Amino acid sequence: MREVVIVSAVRTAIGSFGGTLKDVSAVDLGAIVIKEAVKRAGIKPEQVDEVIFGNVIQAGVGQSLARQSAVYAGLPVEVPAFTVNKLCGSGLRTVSLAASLISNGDADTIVVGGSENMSASPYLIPKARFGYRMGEAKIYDAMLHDGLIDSFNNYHMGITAENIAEKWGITREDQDKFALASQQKAEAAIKAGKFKDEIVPVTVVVFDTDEDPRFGTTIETLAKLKPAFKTGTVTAGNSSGINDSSAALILMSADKAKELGVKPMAKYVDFASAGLDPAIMGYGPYYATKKVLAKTNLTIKDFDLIEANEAFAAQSIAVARDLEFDMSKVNVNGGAIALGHPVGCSGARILVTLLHEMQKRDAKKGLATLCIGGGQGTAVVVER
Amino acid sequence: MREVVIVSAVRTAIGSFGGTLKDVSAVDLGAIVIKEAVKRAGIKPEQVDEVIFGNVIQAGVGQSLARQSAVYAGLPVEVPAFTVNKLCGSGLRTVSLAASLISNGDADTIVVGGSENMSASPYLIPKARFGYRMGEAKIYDAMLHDGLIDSFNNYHMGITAENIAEKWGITREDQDKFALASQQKAEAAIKAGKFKDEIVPVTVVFDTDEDPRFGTTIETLAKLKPAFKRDGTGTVTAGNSSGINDSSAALILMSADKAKELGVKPMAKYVDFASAGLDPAIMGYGPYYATKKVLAKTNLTIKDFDLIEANEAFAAQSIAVARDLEFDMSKVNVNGGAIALGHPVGCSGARILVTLLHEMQKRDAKKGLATLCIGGGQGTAVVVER
Amino acid sequence: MREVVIVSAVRTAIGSFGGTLKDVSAVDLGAIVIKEAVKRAGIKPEQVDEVIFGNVIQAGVGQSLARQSAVYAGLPVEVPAFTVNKLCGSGLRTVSLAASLISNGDADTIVVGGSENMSASPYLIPKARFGYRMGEAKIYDAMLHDGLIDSFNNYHMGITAENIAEKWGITREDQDKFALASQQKAEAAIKAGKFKDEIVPVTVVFDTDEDPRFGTTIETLAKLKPAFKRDGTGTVTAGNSSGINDSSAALILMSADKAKELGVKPMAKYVDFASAGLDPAIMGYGPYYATKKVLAKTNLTIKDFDLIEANEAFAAQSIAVARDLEFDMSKVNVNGGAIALGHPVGCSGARILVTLLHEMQKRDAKKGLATLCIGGGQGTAVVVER
Amino acid sequence: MREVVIVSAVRTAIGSFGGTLKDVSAVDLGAIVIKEAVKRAGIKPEQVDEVIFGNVIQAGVGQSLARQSAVYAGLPVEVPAFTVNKLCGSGLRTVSLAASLISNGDADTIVVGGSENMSASPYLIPKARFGYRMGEAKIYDAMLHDGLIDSFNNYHMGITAENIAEKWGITREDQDKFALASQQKAEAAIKAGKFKDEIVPVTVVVFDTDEDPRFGTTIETLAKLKPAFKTGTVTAGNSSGINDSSAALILMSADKAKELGVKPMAKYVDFASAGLDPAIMGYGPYYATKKVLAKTNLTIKDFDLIEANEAFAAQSIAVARDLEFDMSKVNVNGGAIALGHPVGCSGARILVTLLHEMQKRDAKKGLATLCIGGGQGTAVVVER
């Protein structure tokens, strides 16, 4: 093995569904963050060995996004690239993969991250090729069909949250209280400038501020909302949204960062992925996190900051209780309920957020983890 | 770093465009080969640590194919999985990635491969969400738009074959002759039983590659019309291109340590890989750069390979590559290649490796190369050794 | 008021669903029959004063079919035209309308008829304009949505046939026996050359009705499964319903005065018409009301007709009608009906009239009735006389 | 022959494209005006003998609109109905047809008119049935494909106006001056309440006022606009719009109006239709009007009011010059440039407008005429 470091990390502000980044392609969002990450690391484009990038709703983006974003970022055509799809886990799995390839000597410098434009995703017509012959037929929303709908059970991932709420005893009030605190933390962090260092502006009008948060959210406001997916408890107010954004990081061997005089943001320690019953996919962080702790001989007390993606309050609460998070150190600047869940990006997005806040607080150790549609979880530990 | 071995390798026969596997989903084809791969390895399902699988035209297959296929194959829900898209390279990149992960200690046993159902791929309506407002618009073929059309130049990958025929001076006749040999070798290989070991039956009982055109003659090929250009300048035809096809393939890589512990007799040792980028406009030449690079990593030359699988996307790109890497053509695609057999994009990279390993065993061959060009301007390669 | 005569009558043979005319547009089929109708009348094109033509599934045919067909048929651009949509009734309503116009002095010579290409009809995307925003949606078959599904009940017109089989107590066996006779008579009529005079060839050389199922037996019909209900309650099948079909038909009506002036020998005199509405849920019974009404206008009874064409949309509705109007069945659909020949919706009403006039001439018959049921809950009828 | 009278006439306000009537089906608009026309004539529903109704973009309205609108209007199911498609001429051709049927003794009472919702029209996928096999394909806008595009020449009807502008020497300035006067007349008529008697409200918010007119239009505003269809001169400012609306009238034999004590609004005199070269379809009113004058032994001087549909300024100007209209008596309350052109309705719409203004002015004779896509024109003369 060899030591791996993270040398730069950047993200766009997160667009709302049908919002300010609705007409900026996933490809273009990826290009902006790849270019900017290279700039921030102070290396040459030619120094990148590979690009590994998340993208989940691939329908209609054209050939393999990673390759497109790399070239339009201005990396040489000589740089090879591939696209990862681990659903919600995509952006964060690019990180661990890269660290493994560098550790094993297969590369020195890899650009990682993820891009998703859920707004711009198309509809699908399954039998346009050989025809329907007779009778009405269904067109599908690619973002749901290839993303947010569990393919095994053919229900929304919202139902997986209700399953967890039921099975873990998580009340509507608890869910809404969790949501409120995400909105509160997010509004305070935005106005306090916490995200200024990590965000690259996009000109569409200069878009530089996360727009999904609902400032002034109250417990009463949340309480009014109707369950969105079914007896229900999971609403659009206590669930992440549908969003458009990208994020990029650069991993390097400690060897090559030294040679080039590149100052690392943090050390990559390790990762873990786990599968579990699709019907409770939201609990996957439990298994992932446990595994990475057994690999690293660590404990939850050893983390100064935790980014745990907030797909749904119900799943986040279940995770937090069973890993026994200290919630003072979780998602300190807000989480996905407020900020958004651009599926193929989020995993990298939360790592970008973690790293910059780790710097501001001079934290030692850090955990990023999130649930994955179809029944998975993945986690990464960093240290400074 | 640790040694990595290949313990099993299996594929479906390759369906034609709108042919016998047109209604078996990419997901189901993947399950079949993942299932059989595990069975052939003599391993329990719970032994698998991860599934890394290729799938290029992902429109309408549902959530990430790798996880769906792994679960429908009977692998425990505890096994994590993800889907790789390096276009035509996908299936072979799953192999090199898994090797790096096992070598780095991040796993002991990984299922890899790829599945593509090009026939079942949908059309797309880009502005159905917020509306077209007024006037005509276009719906797109997912297989072309997300696969076989170069997204930088917005022309078909067949034009890249044309760009290469122009710059390397590869005539229509040279292309047709390469295509005839590919058809001849596939016919003899099929009739000689060469594919019987590696193919797993699919009851729709489909067990024979159906895209080959038995009795192909040079005159046959000369009658066909340029498929991508017309206007006089064309040389690439349906007869000297790979087809559009539906198939899956799977392999199991394992640390040498874990193999020995379990008493699994490996098929072969994984040696190394390389990937390279180049000008998208001549993407077909990617094997050259990828092969030169893996050769340098392994300290081998082309003479060292008993058997070579170089994927036949287009005769025009395969000829440029063979010339510039100075292949001994008697050792290349000995059982026929994609012109004859087909090019199920996300599967092919794994497919050619299963074909290579089986021929290597038949021949007691010592060293093997699998390489292929990649839409967008890339190439990847893997060396194996027995 | 003035006398109106029919001077020419012609149809294409009837194409099957996805059959030989599937790629000849409704517009082109209309041009063919309008062309030949004029030629058969021995009239110059410039003699035509108006074209009134039927077309039901208008989605994607372009601007108003009547005008397109009239111009492509070589009629002067000066000839005005419009398209009638009374669903299944359309082609026959063009006839009665033109008669009223000529009788009222608003024209001397009118081309009438209908054209339907059901095979070539498109699908619809209702919210493509302003967008679906989120989630699954439906695309609709134009032929069902704008034709064969009752828009008030949103069930298929086949259910209306089921409603009638229930209320009139018409068994599956009665339906199958009516269907067998229709298949028998069409086979004999075709082989006897009965359709040779009225049919105009279309080179795609299509000149023979292709929907009939020669050698139909009662056992054949009994094997088929209910097409519209299932759940046990079904009796209406593909074998005892009309099909989905593609064809055109045209006729030329003229004042008796203008006919004599020009020396045009008429085929027949137009007598009168009636149209009626009823409960959409039993739309198939519309002929009863329409026929009772035209009988009252003309002071005739059913016994007075030598020949009857009652369109066979569904055996179930045709049996109810025949019973309640007390038809002499030996005089009905003597050359077979729509179960055998097909139901190209916007054409059929004209089609059955061309078939009637030709048989009337063969038989030197004196009086004739053409009637058919209409989706939405209507019926229309026309009496003619030689 | 027998005398025919018009006993009632009514229309909805005309919706803008994507405007207030975008989600009120053509069927429903037809039902509102049929019901209201019956009410205004003071007859029973059972007294209607037949419904003949215009509808041009039929794609996706379901089975034959005339029949649907009749039943949902509350006319007995016993009433027979059929739908006419003479493109732009549809609504007015229903009138003449009906008068012929009544004159000939085939009916006593016919409801006529037209309904078009252009907004709600769908897109078309030609080969969904037997499939596209491979490669991109086109979806079509039904309103253009089955309506506003000349099927012979495969160009917009806008090009037919440019053809006329070129061939008749009609300048951009002349076109824009014509447009301005339509807007001016329309704004004045609306604010003056001229349309209050003829409009039936629709609750969607009570919609009762034509919304397409652009109040405050200036010659300078028009002059700024860019040609819309090609050297060009025809803009969206000097062309009718795309619109949603319905209109209904009731024709009766003089015999039956007498029997029932129904007070007629006017006498139907006669009509004419004409075909001409599709490429100059806008000039069809010339031929139509000439023919109806030869039938009625009348002259343009004999009309106290003229409604000449304003498809395009260029065609309207050409028509007006060659028939030598006195433009003081044409479209006195504004025309389609301001008000809109709901294709299947317009022909009936202009007759509704004509009749009510004929009443207000106590005019004796009246002409309604309009051009028809695909190369036609149609005209009707009424008298009080």
Short mmCIF file of N, CA and C in Angstrom, two decimals, chain B residues 168-255:
data_model
loop_
_atom_site.label_atom_id
_atom_site.label_comp_id
_atom_site.label_asym_id
_atom_site.label_seq_id
_atom_site.Cartn_x
_atom_site.Cartn_y
_atom_site.Cartn_z
N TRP B 168 -4.84 6.29 -42.51
CA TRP B 168 -3.94 5.14 -42.59
C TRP B 168 -3.97 4.51 -43.99
N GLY B 169 -4.82 5.04 -44.89
CA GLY B 169 -4.93 4.55 -46.26
C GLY B 169 -5.34 3.09 -46.28
N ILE B 170 -6.50 2.81 -45.66
CA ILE B 170 -7.05 1.47 -45.59
C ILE B 170 -8.24 1.44 -46.54
N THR B 171 -8.11 0.62 -47.60
CA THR B 171 -9.07 0.61 -48.70
C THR B 171 -10.30 -0.16 -48.25
N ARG B 172 -11.41 0.02 -48.99
CA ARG B 172 -12.61 -0.79 -48.82
C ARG B 172 -12.27 -2.27 -48.97
N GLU B 173 -11.40 -2.64 -49.92
CA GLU B 173 -11.04 -4.04 -50.12
C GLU B 173 -10.28 -4.61 -48.91
N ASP B 174 -9.30 -3.88 -48.36
CA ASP B 174 -8.61 -4.31 -47.14
C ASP B 174 -9.61 -4.55 -46.00
N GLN B 175 -10.59 -3.66 -45.87
CA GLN B 175 -11.58 -3.78 -44.81
C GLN B 175 -12.41 -5.05 -45.02
N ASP B 176 -12.88 -5.25 -46.25
CA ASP B 176 -13.68 -6.42 -46.60
C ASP B 176 -12.89 -7.72 -46.42
N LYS B 177 -11.57 -7.71 -46.65
CA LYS B 177 -10.78 -8.93 -46.51
C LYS B 177 -10.61 -9.30 -45.04
N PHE B 178 -10.36 -8.28 -44.20
CA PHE B 178 -10.31 -8.47 -42.75
C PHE B 178 -11.64 -9.03 -42.24
N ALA B 179 -12.75 -8.55 -42.82
CA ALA B 179 -14.08 -8.95 -42.39
C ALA B 179 -14.33 -10.40 -42.79
N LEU B 180 -13.87 -10.80 -43.98
CA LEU B 180 -14.09 -12.16 -44.47
C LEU B 180 -13.37 -13.14 -43.56
N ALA B 181 -12.13 -12.80 -43.18
CA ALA B 181 -11.38 -13.70 -42.32
C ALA B 181 -12.09 -13.89 -40.98
N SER B 182 -12.62 -12.78 -40.44
CA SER B 182 -13.35 -12.82 -39.18
C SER B 182 -14.58 -13.72 -39.30
N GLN B 183 -15.31 -13.64 -40.42
CA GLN B 183 -16.47 -14.52 -40.67
C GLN B 183 -16.03 -15.98 -40.84
N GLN B 184 -14.89 -16.22 -41.52
CA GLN B 184 -14.41 -17.59 -41.75
C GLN B 184 -14.02 -18.24 -40.42
N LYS B 185 -13.25 -17.52 -39.62
CA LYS B 185 -12.76 -18.08 -38.37
C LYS B 185 -13.92 -18.34 -37.39
N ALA B 186 -14.92 -17.45 -37.34
CA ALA B 186 -16.07 -17.66 -36.45
C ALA B 186 -16.87 -18.89 -36.88
N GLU B 187 -17.05 -19.08 -38.19
CA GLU B 187 -17.80 -20.23 -38.68
C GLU B 187 -17.08 -21.50 -38.24
N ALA B 188 -15.77 -21.58 -38.50
CA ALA B 188 -15.03 -22.80 -38.19
C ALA B 188 -14.99 -23.03 -36.68
N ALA B 189 -14.79 -21.94 -35.93
CA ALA B 189 -14.73 -22.02 -34.48
C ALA B 189 -16.05 -22.55 -33.90
N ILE B 190 -17.18 -22.01 -34.40
CA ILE B 190 -18.49 -22.42 -33.92
C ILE B 190 -18.70 -23.90 -34.26
N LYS B 191 -18.50 -24.27 -35.53
CA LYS B 191 -18.71 -25.65 -35.95
C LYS B 191 -17.69 -26.59 -35.31
N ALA B 192 -16.52 -26.06 -34.94
CA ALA B 192 -15.53 -26.92 -34.28
C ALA B 192 -15.83 -27.07 -32.79
N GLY B 193 -16.92 -26.47 -32.27
CA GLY B 193 -17.23 -26.59 -30.85
C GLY B 193 -16.39 -25.68 -29.95
N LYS B 194 -15.73 -24.66 -30.52
CA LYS B 194 -14.75 -23.87 -29.78
C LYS B 194 -15.40 -23.07 -28.64
N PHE B 195 -16.67 -22.69 -28.81
CA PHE B 195 -17.38 -21.86 -27.85
C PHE B 195 -18.20 -22.67 -26.85
N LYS B 196 -18.19 -24.00 -26.93
CA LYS B 196 -19.09 -24.79 -26.09
C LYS B 196 -18.76 -24.64 -24.60
N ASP B 197 -17.48 -24.48 -24.23
CA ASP B 197 -17.12 -24.43 -22.81
C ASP B 197 -17.52 -23.11 -22.14
N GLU B 198 -17.31 -21.99 -22.83
CA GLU B 198 -17.50 -20.66 -22.26
C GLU B 198 -18.95 -20.19 -22.27
N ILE B 199 -19.80 -20.77 -23.11
CA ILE B 199 -21.17 -20.27 -23.27
C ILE B 199 -22.09 -20.96 -22.27
N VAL B 200 -22.93 -20.13 -21.64
CA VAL B 200 -24.00 -20.65 -20.82
C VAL B 200 -25.33 -20.51 -21.57
N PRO B 201 -26.12 -21.61 -21.67
CA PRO B 201 -27.46 -21.59 -22.27
C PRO B 201 -28.42 -20.60 -21.61
N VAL B 202 -29.24 -19.95 -22.45
CA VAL B 202 -30.38 -19.14 -22.03
C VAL B 202 -31.65 -19.71 -22.68
N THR B 203 -32.63 -20.14 -21.89
CA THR B 203 -33.92 -20.57 -22.44
C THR B 203 -34.78 -19.33 -22.64
N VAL B 204 -35.30 -19.13 -23.85
CA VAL B 204 -36.05 -17.92 -24.14
C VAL B 204 -37.55 -18.24 -24.09
N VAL B 205 -33.83 -22.78 -26.49
CA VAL B 205 -32.51 -22.85 -25.77
C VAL B 205 -31.45 -22.17 -26.63
N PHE B 206 -31.08 -20.94 -26.27
CA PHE B 206 -30.13 -20.14 -27.04
C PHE B 206 -28.72 -20.40 -26.52
N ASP B 207 -27.87 -21.01 -27.37
CA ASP B 207 -26.54 -21.39 -26.93
C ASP B 207 -25.51 -21.21 -28.05
N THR B 208 -25.91 -20.59 -29.16
CA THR B 208 -25.02 -20.44 -30.31
C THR B 208 -25.07 -19.00 -30.81
N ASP B 209 -23.90 -18.39 -30.92
CA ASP B 209 -23.72 -17.06 -31.49
C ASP B 209 -24.47 -16.99 -32.83
N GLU B 210 -25.39 -16.02 -32.99
CA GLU B 210 -26.29 -15.99 -34.14
C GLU B 210 -25.98 -14.84 -35.09
N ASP B 211 -25.03 -13.95 -34.77
CA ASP B 211 -24.75 -12.84 -35.65
C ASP B 211 -23.86 -13.24 -36.82
N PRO B 212 -22.97 -14.26 -36.71
CA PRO B 212 -22.13 -14.66 -37.84
C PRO B 212 -22.94 -14.99 -39.10
N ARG B 213 -22.36 -14.60 -40.24
CA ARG B 213 -22.98 -14.82 -41.54
C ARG B 213 -22.19 -15.91 -42.29
N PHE B 214 -22.58 -17.16 -42.04
CA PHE B 214 -21.94 -18.32 -42.61
C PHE B 214 -21.94 -18.21 -44.14
N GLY B 215 -20.82 -18.59 -44.75
CA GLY B 215 -20.70 -18.58 -46.20
C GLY B 215 -20.44 -17.18 -46.75
N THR B 216 -20.05 -16.25 -45.89
CA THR B 216 -19.66 -14.94 -46.37
C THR B 216 -18.57 -15.11 -47.45
N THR B 217 -18.71 -14.39 -48.57
CA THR B 217 -17.68 -14.37 -49.60
C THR B 217 -17.20 -12.93 -49.76
N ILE B 218 -16.07 -12.75 -50.45
CA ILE B 218 -15.57 -11.40 -50.68
C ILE B 218 -16.54 -10.65 -51.59
N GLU B 219 -17.24 -11.39 -52.47
CA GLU B 219 -18.19 -10.80 -53.40
C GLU B 219 -19.40 -10.28 -52.63
N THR B 220 -19.89 -11.09 -51.69
CA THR B 220 -20.92 -10.68 -50.75
C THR B 220 -20.59 -9.31 -50.15
N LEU B 221 -19.38 -9.17 -49.60
CA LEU B 221 -19.00 -7.98 -48.88
C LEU B 221 -18.91 -6.79 -49.84
N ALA B 222 -18.50 -7.04 -51.10
CA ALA B 222 -18.30 -5.98 -52.07
C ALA B 222 -19.63 -5.40 -52.58
N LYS B 223 -20.72 -6.16 -52.49
CA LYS B 223 -22.04 -5.70 -52.91
C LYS B 223 -22.63 -4.66 -51.94
N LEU B 224 -22.19 -4.63 -50.66
CA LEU B 224 -22.83 -3.83 -49.61
C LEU B 224 -22.50 -2.36 -49.77
N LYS B 225 -23.38 -1.49 -49.29
CA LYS B 225 -23.26 -0.06 -49.52
C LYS B 225 -22.66 0.60 -48.28
N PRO B 226 -21.79 1.63 -48.40
CA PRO B 226 -21.28 2.33 -47.22
C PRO B 226 -22.41 2.70 -46.26
N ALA B 227 -22.24 2.34 -44.97
CA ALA B 227 -23.30 2.47 -43.98
C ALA B 227 -23.31 3.86 -43.33
N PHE B 228 -22.21 4.59 -43.35
CA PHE B 228 -22.15 5.84 -42.58
C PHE B 228 -21.91 7.14 -43.31
N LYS B 229 -21.44 7.07 -44.54
CA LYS B 229 -21.14 8.28 -45.26
C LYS B 229 -21.89 8.46 -46.57
N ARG B 230 -21.91 7.46 -47.42
CA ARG B 230 -22.48 7.64 -48.76
C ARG B 230 -21.64 8.70 -49.49
N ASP B 231 -22.24 9.59 -50.25
CA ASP B 231 -21.50 10.69 -50.89
C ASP B 231 -20.20 10.31 -51.59
N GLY B 232 -19.94 9.03 -51.72
CA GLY B 232 -18.78 8.59 -52.45
C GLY B 232 -17.63 8.24 -51.59
N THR B 233 -17.44 8.99 -50.51
CA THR B 233 -16.28 8.78 -49.68
C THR B 233 -16.31 7.54 -48.77
N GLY B 234 -17.45 6.85 -48.65
CA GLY B 234 -17.56 5.72 -47.75
C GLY B 234 -16.94 4.38 -48.05
N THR B 235 -16.39 3.73 -47.04
CA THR B 235 -15.79 2.42 -47.19
C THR B 235 -16.28 1.50 -46.09
N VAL B 236 -16.74 2.08 -44.99
CA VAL B 236 -17.22 1.28 -43.88
C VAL B 236 -18.69 0.93 -44.12
N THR B 237 -18.99 -0.36 -44.02
CA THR B 237 -20.30 -0.91 -44.33
C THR B 237 -20.79 -1.71 -43.12
N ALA B 238 -22.02 -2.22 -43.19
CA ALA B 238 -22.51 -3.16 -42.18
C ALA B 238 -21.68 -4.44 -42.14
N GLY B 239 -21.13 -4.85 -43.30
CA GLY B 239 -20.39 -6.10 -43.40
C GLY B 239 -18.97 -6.05 -42.83
N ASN B 240 -18.41 -4.85 -42.72
CA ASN B 240 -17.04 -4.68 -42.23
C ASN B 240 -17.03 -3.80 -40.98
N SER B 241 -18.20 -3.67 -40.33
CA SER B 241 -18.36 -3.14 -38.98
C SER B 241 -18.85 -4.25 -38.05
N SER B 242 -18.64 -4.12 -36.74
CA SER B 242 -19.38 -4.91 -35.77
C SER B 242 -20.86 -4.54 -35.86
N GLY B 243 -21.70 -5.43 -35.34
CA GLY B 243 -23.13 -5.18 -35.27
C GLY B 243 -23.54 -4.51 -33.96
N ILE B 244 -24.86 -4.37 -33.83
CA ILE B 244 -25.55 -4.01 -32.61
C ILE B 244 -26.09 -5.30 -32.01
N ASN B 245 -25.83 -5.56 -30.72
CA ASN B 245 -26.00 -6.90 -30.16
C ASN B 245 -26.31 -6.88 -28.66
N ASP B 246 -26.78 -8.04 -28.19
CA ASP B 246 -27.29 -8.25 -26.85
C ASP B 246 -26.62 -9.49 -26.25
N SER B 247 -25.92 -9.32 -25.12
CA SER B 247 -25.24 -10.44 -24.48
C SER B 247 -24.68 -9.99 -23.13
N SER B 248 -24.32 -10.98 -22.29
CA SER B 248 -23.65 -10.70 -21.03
C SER B 248 -22.40 -11.58 -20.90
N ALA B 249 -21.50 -11.20 -19.97
CA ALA B 249 -20.33 -12.01 -19.63
C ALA B 249 -19.92 -11.74 -18.18
N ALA B 250 -19.41 -12.76 -17.49
CA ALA B 250 -18.93 -12.58 -16.13
C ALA B 250 -17.68 -13.42 -15.88
N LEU B 251 -16.83 -12.91 -14.98
CA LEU B 251 -15.61 -13.54 -14.53
C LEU B 251 -15.52 -13.34 -13.02
N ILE B 252 -14.72 -14.18 -12.37
CA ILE B 252 -14.48 -14.02 -10.95
C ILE B 252 -12.98 -13.91 -10.76
N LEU B 253 -12.56 -12.78 -10.16
CA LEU B 253 -11.17 -12.59 -9.77
C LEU B 253 -11.09 -12.84 -8.28
N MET B 254 -9.93 -13.33 -7.84
CA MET B 254 -9.70 -13.64 -6.44
C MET B 254 -8.21 -13.46 -6.14
N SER B 255 -7.85 -13.06 -4.91
CA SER B 255 -6.46 -13.12 -4.50
C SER B 255 -5.98 -14.57 -4.65
#
